[PDB]
Amino acid sequence: SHQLTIVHLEARDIDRPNPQLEIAPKEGTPIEGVLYQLYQLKSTEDGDLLAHWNSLTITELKKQAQQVFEATTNQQGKATFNQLPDGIYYGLAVKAGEKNRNVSAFLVDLSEDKVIYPKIIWSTGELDLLKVGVDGDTKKPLAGVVFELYEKNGRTPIRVKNGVHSQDIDAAKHLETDSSGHIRISGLIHGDYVLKEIETQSGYQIGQAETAVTIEKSKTVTVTIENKKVPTPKVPSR
Protein backbone atom coordinates (compact mmCIF):
# COMPACT_ATOMS: atom_id res chain seq x y z
CA SER A 1 0.00 0.00 0.00
CA HIS A 2 1.06 3.60 -0.84
CA GLN A 3 0.04 7.19 -0.20
CA LEU A 4 -1.18 9.36 -3.04
CA THR A 5 -1.73 13.11 -2.75
CA ILE A 6 -3.40 15.10 -5.53
CA VAL A 7 -2.59 18.81 -5.28
CA HIS A 8 -5.06 21.05 -7.08
CA LEU A 9 -3.48 24.49 -7.80
CA GLU A 10 -4.61 27.25 -10.09
CA ALA A 11 -1.29 28.47 -11.48
CA ARG A 12 -0.24 30.90 -14.22
CA ASP A 13 1.20 29.54 -17.48
CA ILE A 14 4.53 31.04 -16.30
CA ASP A 15 4.35 29.17 -12.95
CA ARG A 16 4.27 25.89 -14.84
CA PRO A 17 6.52 25.65 -17.90
CA ASN A 18 6.79 22.12 -19.35
CA PRO A 19 4.13 20.79 -16.95
CA GLN A 20 4.95 17.33 -15.55
CA LEU A 21 2.64 15.45 -13.18
CA GLU A 22 5.08 15.16 -10.27
CA ILE A 23 6.72 18.62 -10.59
CA ALA A 24 5.09 21.36 -8.45
CA PRO A 25 4.33 24.61 -10.21
CA LYS A 26 6.47 27.54 -9.04
CA GLU A 27 3.41 29.28 -7.59
CA GLY A 28 -0.23 28.23 -7.38
CA THR A 29 -3.43 28.81 -5.45
CA PRO A 30 -4.94 25.81 -3.68
CA ILE A 31 -8.57 25.05 -4.36
CA GLU A 32 -10.72 23.36 -1.74
CA GLY A 33 -13.76 21.15 -2.49
CA VAL A 34 -12.67 19.56 -5.78
CA LEU A 35 -13.76 15.93 -6.05
CA TYR A 36 -11.09 13.53 -7.33
CA GLN A 37 -11.78 9.92 -8.20
CA LEU A 38 -9.15 7.24 -8.71
CA TYR A 39 -10.00 4.08 -10.69
CA GLN A 40 -7.81 1.05 -10.00
CA LEU A 41 -7.07 -0.62 -13.37
CA LYS A 42 -7.83 -4.33 -13.85
CA SER A 43 -5.81 -4.57 -17.08
CA THR A 44 -2.89 -2.79 -18.74
CA GLU A 45 -3.11 -4.48 -22.17
CA ASP A 46 -3.91 -1.33 -24.14
CA GLY A 47 -0.81 0.37 -25.56
CA ASP A 48 -2.84 3.60 -25.64
CA LEU A 49 -3.91 3.29 -22.01
CA LEU A 50 -4.55 6.94 -21.15
CA ALA A 51 -6.54 7.45 -24.37
CA HIS A 52 -8.52 4.30 -23.61
CA TRP A 53 -9.49 5.54 -20.16
CA ASN A 54 -10.19 9.08 -21.43
CA SER A 55 -12.68 7.57 -23.95
CA LEU A 56 -14.84 5.98 -21.21
CA THR A 57 -17.97 7.57 -19.77
CA ILE A 58 -18.12 8.11 -16.02
CA THR A 59 -20.16 4.96 -15.38
CA GLU A 60 -17.91 2.93 -17.71
CA LEU A 61 -14.91 3.83 -15.50
CA LYS A 62 -16.56 1.93 -12.64
CA LYS A 63 -17.31 -1.07 -14.90
CA GLN A 64 -13.66 -1.44 -15.99
CA ALA A 65 -12.03 -0.68 -12.58
CA GLN A 66 -11.15 -3.11 -9.70
CA GLN A 67 -11.58 -0.67 -6.74
CA VAL A 68 -12.63 3.03 -6.86
CA PHE A 69 -11.44 5.70 -4.40
CA GLU A 70 -12.59 9.30 -3.87
CA ALA A 71 -11.19 12.32 -2.05
CA THR A 72 -12.09 15.97 -1.87
CA THR A 73 -9.34 18.61 -1.89
CA ASN A 74 -8.77 20.21 1.51
CA GLN A 75 -7.64 23.68 2.68
CA GLN A 76 -4.18 23.08 1.13
CA GLY A 77 -5.74 21.95 -2.18
CA LYS A 78 -4.85 18.33 -1.33
CA ALA A 79 -7.07 15.33 -2.09
CA THR A 80 -5.48 12.55 -0.04
CA PHE A 81 -5.61 8.84 -0.87
CA ASN A 82 -4.45 6.59 1.94
CA GLN A 83 -3.15 3.03 1.75
CA LEU A 84 -3.93 2.47 -1.91
CA PRO A 85 -2.87 -1.01 -3.12
CA ASP A 86 0.08 -1.14 -5.41
CA GLY A 87 -1.33 -0.69 -8.93
CA ILE A 88 -2.11 1.58 -11.88
CA TYR A 89 -4.78 4.22 -11.31
CA TYR A 90 -6.68 6.53 -13.60
CA GLY A 91 -7.54 9.79 -11.86
CA LEU A 92 -9.89 12.60 -12.86
CA ALA A 93 -11.80 15.47 -11.31
CA VAL A 94 -15.60 15.13 -11.27
CA LYS A 95 -18.18 17.93 -11.32
CA ALA A 96 -21.95 17.76 -11.79
CA GLY A 97 -21.78 13.95 -12.18
CA GLU A 98 -19.32 14.06 -15.10
CA LYS A 99 -15.64 14.54 -15.81
CA ASN A 100 -14.52 18.10 -15.21
CA ARG A 101 -12.92 18.81 -18.62
CA ASN A 102 -10.80 21.62 -17.10
CA VAL A 103 -8.67 19.08 -15.25
CA SER A 104 -6.55 16.77 -17.41
CA ALA A 105 -7.11 13.17 -16.35
CA PHE A 106 -3.97 11.14 -15.64
CA LEU A 107 -2.54 7.71 -14.98
CA VAL A 108 -0.58 7.06 -11.77
CA ASP A 109 1.94 4.19 -11.72
CA LEU A 110 1.49 3.70 -7.94
CA SER A 111 4.58 1.67 -7.04
CA GLU A 112 5.65 4.09 -4.25
CA ASP A 113 4.15 7.13 -2.45
CA LYS A 114 3.24 9.81 -5.01
CA VAL A 115 2.48 13.53 -5.07
CA ILE A 116 0.80 14.66 -8.30
CA TYR A 117 -0.24 18.05 -9.68
CA PRO A 118 -2.99 17.62 -12.29
CA LYS A 119 -2.88 20.05 -15.25
CA ILE A 120 -5.61 22.53 -14.52
CA ILE A 121 -7.07 25.22 -16.75
CA TRP A 122 -8.98 28.12 -15.22
CA SER A 123 -8.23 31.42 -17.08
CA THR A 124 -11.39 33.00 -18.52
CA GLY A 125 -12.43 35.05 -21.53
CA GLU A 126 -15.68 36.39 -22.88
CA LEU A 127 -18.26 35.79 -25.59
CA ASP A 128 -19.99 38.65 -27.38
CA LEU A 129 -22.84 37.42 -29.56
CA LEU A 130 -24.60 39.75 -31.95
CA LYS A 131 -27.87 38.39 -33.30
CA VAL A 132 -29.26 39.96 -36.47
CA GLY A 133 -32.45 39.65 -38.50
CA VAL A 134 -32.04 39.60 -42.30
CA ASP A 135 -34.53 41.16 -44.78
CA GLY A 136 -33.07 41.07 -48.31
CA ASP A 137 -29.71 42.89 -48.16
CA THR A 138 -30.45 44.58 -44.81
CA LYS A 139 -29.47 43.28 -41.37
CA LYS A 140 -30.60 44.71 -38.02
CA PRO A 141 -30.11 43.64 -34.37
CA LEU A 142 -32.76 41.28 -33.08
CA ALA A 143 -33.96 41.49 -29.49
CA GLY A 144 -35.49 38.74 -27.37
CA VAL A 145 -33.90 35.77 -29.18
CA VAL A 146 -33.25 32.86 -26.79
CA PHE A 147 -30.05 30.81 -26.64
CA GLU A 148 -28.44 28.23 -24.34
CA LEU A 149 -24.67 27.66 -24.06
CA TYR A 150 -22.95 24.28 -23.68
CA GLU A 151 -19.41 23.02 -23.38
CA LYS A 152 -18.53 21.23 -26.66
CA ASN A 153 -20.21 17.76 -26.58
CA GLY A 154 -21.79 18.74 -23.24
CA ARG A 155 -25.19 17.52 -22.04
CA THR A 156 -25.94 20.28 -19.55
CA PRO A 157 -26.31 24.04 -20.26
CA ILE A 158 -23.93 26.61 -18.74
CA ARG A 159 -25.77 29.05 -16.47
CA VAL A 160 -25.22 32.82 -16.28
CA LYS A 161 -25.82 35.56 -13.65
CA ASN A 162 -24.54 39.20 -13.58
CA GLY A 163 -23.47 38.65 -17.25
CA VAL A 164 -21.04 36.04 -15.99
CA HIS A 165 -20.87 32.25 -15.95
CA SER A 166 -22.27 31.42 -12.50
CA GLN A 167 -22.82 28.38 -10.31
CA ASP A 168 -25.41 30.10 -8.13
CA ILE A 169 -28.77 28.39 -7.75
CA ASP A 170 -30.51 31.37 -9.41
CA ALA A 171 -28.12 31.45 -12.40
CA ALA A 172 -30.21 30.80 -15.52
CA LYS A 173 -29.70 28.63 -18.62
CA HIS A 174 -31.90 30.89 -20.75
CA LEU A 175 -29.92 33.62 -22.45
CA GLU A 176 -31.77 36.39 -24.27
CA THR A 177 -30.46 38.96 -26.74
CA ASP A 178 -30.90 42.48 -25.41
CA SER A 179 -32.45 45.48 -27.24
CA SER A 180 -29.14 45.87 -29.14
CA GLY A 181 -29.12 42.21 -30.29
CA HIS A 182 -26.34 41.19 -27.86
CA ILE A 183 -25.67 38.39 -25.39
CA ARG A 184 -22.38 39.04 -23.54
CA ILE A 185 -20.98 36.42 -21.15
CA SER A 186 -17.64 36.80 -19.35
CA GLY A 187 -15.92 34.42 -16.92
CA LEU A 188 -15.92 31.46 -19.34
CA ILE A 189 -12.89 29.23 -18.95
CA HIS A 190 -11.02 29.13 -22.26
CA GLY A 191 -12.02 26.25 -24.58
CA ASP A 192 -14.77 25.14 -26.95
CA TYR A 193 -18.45 25.85 -26.50
CA VAL A 194 -21.70 25.57 -28.45
CA LEU A 195 -24.48 28.13 -28.70
CA LYS A 196 -27.88 26.57 -29.18
CA GLU A 197 -30.60 28.83 -30.56
CA ILE A 198 -33.85 27.93 -28.78
CA GLU A 199 -36.39 30.45 -30.00
CA THR A 200 -36.31 33.38 -32.37
CA GLN A 201 -38.62 36.33 -33.07
CA SER A 202 -41.87 36.02 -34.93
CA GLY A 203 -41.29 36.39 -38.65
CA TYR A 204 -37.88 34.64 -38.55
CA GLN A 205 -36.45 31.14 -38.88
CA ILE A 206 -33.73 29.51 -36.84
CA GLY A 207 -31.06 29.01 -39.56
CA GLN A 208 -28.12 27.60 -37.63
CA ALA A 209 -29.43 25.69 -34.60
CA GLU A 210 -25.96 25.16 -33.11
CA THR A 211 -22.96 27.47 -33.50
CA ALA A 212 -19.42 26.55 -32.39
CA VAL A 213 -17.53 29.16 -30.40
CA THR A 214 -14.00 29.10 -29.00
CA ILE A 215 -13.35 31.22 -25.89
CA GLU A 216 -9.80 32.56 -25.71
CA LYS A 217 -8.39 33.63 -22.37
CA SER A 218 -8.23 37.41 -21.70
CA LYS A 219 -9.99 38.06 -25.01
CA THR A 220 -13.54 38.56 -26.27
CA VAL A 221 -14.72 36.40 -29.15
CA THR A 222 -17.22 38.29 -31.32
CA VAL A 223 -19.77 36.18 -33.18
CA THR A 224 -22.65 37.23 -35.43
CA ILE A 225 -25.55 34.86 -36.01
CA GLU A 226 -28.15 35.61 -38.69
CA ASN A 227 -31.88 34.98 -38.55
CA LYS A 228 -33.54 34.94 -41.99
CA LYS A 229 -37.14 36.03 -42.53
CA VAL A 230 -39.69 33.26 -43.18
CA PRO A 231 -40.23 32.72 -46.97
CA THR A 232 -43.76 33.38 -48.25
CA PRO A 233 -44.22 31.67 -51.64
CA LYS A 234 -47.68 31.36 -53.20
CA VAL A 235 -49.19 27.87 -53.50
CA PRO A 236 -48.09 26.61 -56.94
CA SER A 237 -50.64 25.45 -59.49
CA ARG A 238 -50.51 21.93 -60.87
SS3 category, 235: coil
52 CB contacts (<8 Å, ≥6 apart)? 46
* Residue 6 to residue 16: CA distance in whole angstroms: 16
Phi/psi for 17 (5° steps) reads: -65, 150
The alpha carbons of the chain give a radius of gyration, in whole angstroms, of 23
* Residue 81 to residue 91: CA distance in whole angstroms: 11
* Residue 200 to residue 216: CA distance in whole angstroms: 27
Q: How many CA atoms lie within 13 A of 78 on its CB side?
A: 11
* Residue 6 to residue 9: CA distance in whole angstroms: 10
Domains of the chain listed by start with CATH number: 1-121 (2.60.40.10), 122-230 (2.60.40.10)
Cite the beta strand spans of 160-209 per DSSP E. Answer: 160-161, 164-165, 175-176, 182-189, 191-199, 204-205
* Residue 48 to residue 90: CA distance in whole angstroms: 13
Pairing state of beta strands 164-165 and 210-215?
unpaired
Sequence letter at residue 111:
S
234 CB contacts (<8 Å, ≥6 apart)? none
Report the structure determination method.
X-ray
* Helix ranges (DSSP H) in 55-127: 58-64
SS3 category, 200: coil
* Residue 238 to residue 236: CA distance in whole angstroms: 7
Instruction: Write the secondary structure of 5-29 as one string of H (helix), E (strand) and C (coil).
Output: EEECEECCHHHCCCCCCCCCCCCCE
Task: Count Cβ atoms below 10 Å from residue 105 Cβ, excluding itself.
Answer: 20
Closest CA to 149 of 100, 121, 189, 201: 189
* Residue 93 to residue 102: CA distance in whole angstroms: 9
CA distances from 221 to 66, 75, 109 (A): 44, 35, 40
